[model samples]
Target: VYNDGYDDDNYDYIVKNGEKWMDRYEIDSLIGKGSFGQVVKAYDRVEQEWVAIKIIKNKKAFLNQAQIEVRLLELMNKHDTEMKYYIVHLKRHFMFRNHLCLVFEMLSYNLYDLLRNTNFRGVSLNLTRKFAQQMCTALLFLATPELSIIHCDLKPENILLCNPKRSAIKIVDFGSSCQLGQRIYQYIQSRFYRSPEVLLGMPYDLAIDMWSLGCILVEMHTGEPLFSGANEVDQMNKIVEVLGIPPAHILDQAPKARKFFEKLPDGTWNLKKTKDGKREYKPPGTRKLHNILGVETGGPGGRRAGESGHTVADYLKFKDLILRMLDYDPKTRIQPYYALQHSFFKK
Candidate 1:
């Protein structure tokens, strides 16, 4: 019911502006397509430079989702320093029909596409750490306590590697993003990198992005998705295989009223209850994550939580830090700004 403003008649040809696409920028080719909208490689005639033109999904078509992204962009722009390391939001407006246009600095490729081209080769750990540090630096700045913006959707696909520094993974695609507020419905992220709250259909905040960062770090290490699952149950199973099940307090925060919550189990999704209580879960791969996440001793299959060396190597590269970022509860989830101070990035 909040009216952002849009025209009814002009929405049809919004995506295809014909010559208008040529007017704003020189069209190169199609780069991507997703819930955010269609992205094309083009050169901005007005700015006289290369840029990525994302014809954002029509607000009228995808209201809540589009609005959330636009709001987050506005918030990120306000942070001149930290958000700078990310993409440069050149401009946005309704160019033709109902298509909303978002112009950004063009990038060579996204992390996902890059890995595909590299054929999943082993990237060096030092290189991974460098990217991690930069990402965290920008994230810490974005988590500027005053107006917190949590990017709920963080995955290799969502991350774009820039032009000159193609090695850097710039966090783009704030379409599935959420601000200080929370989401009631499920499905706020891609399956492989989704946080626990997303899988459980529980409302969540910014920390979800941290879990995503962890997933990306791991992918960079192995050039493969850490938790690739089809649905919520599969998603949880993958995460648990790596990080283990949530604690009693974390499980208690579950919202039983969600549509995704059910007492039934189908092949598509799984719902389960244990001593902690009933909660939905999923696993992407054979390794349920509880064993890999935190610190623990007791050798191999024992699965004990203790003071063993938390090298965080087998776990996500930023293992301990990612654990704090994966907090199911928003209140406890470390804000992006505070994460800057984490010992992991103390250097």
Candidate 2:
């Protein structure tokens, strides 16, 4: 009877602050809530340390998804016992009142929260570079042959600051992750950072996370999303506005190509109008990356002409790396190892 109640529509376990779970974890507060479940801050009596406990919903599908997450996190923790990589570490898990609870090391604010703290003006290129290096290393670790993991969602919100005053961060929320050969969930990735391959309904792989990293890095420096699309079609249109149309070869085989493009009589392709036909996109490639970065103009948050890390050279190198990450073909998109070697990472 204690576990019988759940929120009607979402089936979320109604969490109560100050409650005890398994007679060990003292629930402190609700830290986060999502479709998957609610996360609570708790005090571990045995360990005498604070932890964040993710309580999976009381539904079959969510339970299955949480199981996958536990498997992946355990695999990652086992491989990264030395804690060299930046992925969050799952401490333990247990069944509490029909909810599967995952205990994780307590972390500070997320990158998105950091962005908000900056008043959305964004951090300096130097700070962004620091984050880039750590994330690249983590990605490289994930790409190891034995691991072959894919973090299906890689947005700023999923990256957490290890310490409020330091640059150290950890990638969290592997709830959507899967091994390379085990693809699941077609509708993955958040809108702004979604990759072209996923947008076209093509089979995706580790490269999609690289695409998200590209979008995230750009936003970190510029304080704005590169392609803030309202829907899939609008997203493709936004991407084309900045990066130009996908190559005909990609569109030719894309299962959902017809949703966004029209095959011309001459075997060329053109983007289709939105269903409502109320919006007009800029000419493809018209919105150049150089202009977007304000290479000579000091960009959206206005880094200023004489700023140390805002030099034109720095922006160019950053732009080049982003282009490679944003490459339309996942087959050739920049890999984590190569991305770490990009000139932007140089001191």
Candidate 3:
């Protein structure tokens, strides 16, 4: 009923210039697209502002899923105006043809854009700390009692800045989100930020988001995925190289452990698949965190080397935080509330 006359047009490209919505919004341009919907940038003629409209494909499943996202946004919007804004504001939702459209306050750019602007060299320690703190604050809000929403996906692309000048970030895209402990979806999170618990088919919780934050922080600091695996098999090895193999008891609980790993006579772990489906030996190639981070030998720290004890000291704080967040055991991984207090973020 909300569509009036425009609903009769092509459902895929529902909006075009000068078209009016409820005598309010005027269609502008298509900004983005995904599996479920297309996001169009539009002008709010009445409010005199630009807004983004996410139009779901004409399908029952996507419609229902978008409804859930709208509802979650509504619930978060109640707290959004409380001075420390984190979640994107969902202005409204309506049905057009068979598709559902959700309105939101437009944002400038995403974290990935900033990374690209920096030429993949990553950001300064100060900016990285700021981003990490903001993310932890947002995650802490979701994990808190009032909301308890699990942001199943958290990555640079989903984080947006308030504006080009401000460092504050808002967490966007709740399509992959669910109430805490909900597990109807088998797969969650993008591959790089995906947690080990999910990779091994183990039961997971909000700690999964923390795991993702760890990966994201490292990427933001280094301009590359901490574990850039070609596939699931290679991914596990990449993580193992950095964090060392997970404890035996933890692996024993993994539903898919044997699919990727096996014990050997040398008392070490070996890849059982993808690396030719044989018992592949892996040395305890203990590469330290500082080395992988490029802080020890190539970047700013490398230039100073031993002359600047300050570089090593400062990076140790950074490395320590990464270590805590990337702990192999989910139960022992640092919680967001506690993460906020880490000295790495100190002014």
Candidate 4:
């Protein structure tokens, strides 16, 4: 429902493409539209660089939140030398036409675009490894004591190739990020990559980022969302179907636990469902990650099973890494640094 964020009615007053801002930045073209506002490719006359300007909506709530996002990015970018970091460099930000404009150095196509370029058939295993390593490095930096920022959104669209040749990738869009140990929004992360703690209304931390990373790596191999649930409830069901139910201690802390789960007559836990306005019990069917992710669709578009090299030790190690990242208990889930150390990255 919140996906329809960039309605023309709400953004009718913002500056149009090709417009000039602050007598320094000239808008070139509108490259993207989102719930908050439109992002335009703009040229910086003074700096002689191409940059992106995300013009925030005029609503008070959105404007205030954008201010916080800007501060968070600045805090994270503070220590990186020469402004060279895996995350995008914020050129500057300013206000124009009653909207908060965020400026950043222009980058090339995002991961989502790369996926499309390959016809959604998935990239090579080597390419996936290269990108995964880069992402782990960036996330490890974020998890450090110096930066400790939780990237609330970590979908393909948020990661961009640094240049047209796809030599390197950079993380972008910090508007949804928050300081570690401090969560301001109840709803965070895209639906597909959302961690169980977020869906179940439990307090979450940086582990959610690791969860998202797991999903992204799988998508690189499968060329589709690992969990394609229609809504939050369906998404929870998909997760449990693969990762199994959460432990009682975790369910106890979730505010919405009863709505989605119930205790059986025995000590076992069961998934709850509603049909025709009545409660129904459903088995938390045992669906292992290996079964769902096995050689079925882990290679190029035309390749069949066994051709993708799923039985190799490297692939098995990769599977182990994903399982740890998708662990139900946040306490035991793999941290970004620990993930980088896993044998999956031995190459």
Best by TM-score: 2
Candidate 2 lDDT over residue span 142-232, tens digit each: 8888889999889998999988999999998888899999997888899999998888889998999999999999898778888999999
Write model 1 residue lDDT over 234-271, tens digit each, in one string. 66665665555554455556663232323333323233
Winner on TM-score (2 vs 4): 2
Error of 3 at 138 (Å): 0.7
Better of 1 and 2 by lDDT: 2
Instruction: Give each model a TM-score.
Output: 0.73, 0.95, 0.88, 0.89
Prediction RMSDs, each to the true structure? 7.9, 1.9, 3.9, 4.1
RMSD in Å for model 3: 3.9
**What TM-score does structure 2 among the candidates reach?**
0.95
How many angstroms is residue 21 displaced in model 4 relative to the true structure, after the best TM-score fit? 2.2
Better of 3 and 4 by TM-score: 4
For all candidates in order, the CA lDDT equals 0.61, 0.87, 0.79, 0.79
Window of ten residues with lowest summed lDDT in model 4: 295-304
Model 4 clash tally? 1
Worst 10 residues of 1 by lDDT: 298-307
User: After superposing candidate 3, which stretches have Cα over 4 Å from the reference?
Assistant: 1-11, 80-84, 263-270, 273-285, 298-310
Provide the global lDDT of candidate 3 against the true structure.
0.79
Q: Which scores higher on lDDT, 2 or 4?
A: 2
> Which residue pairs clash within candidate 2?
none
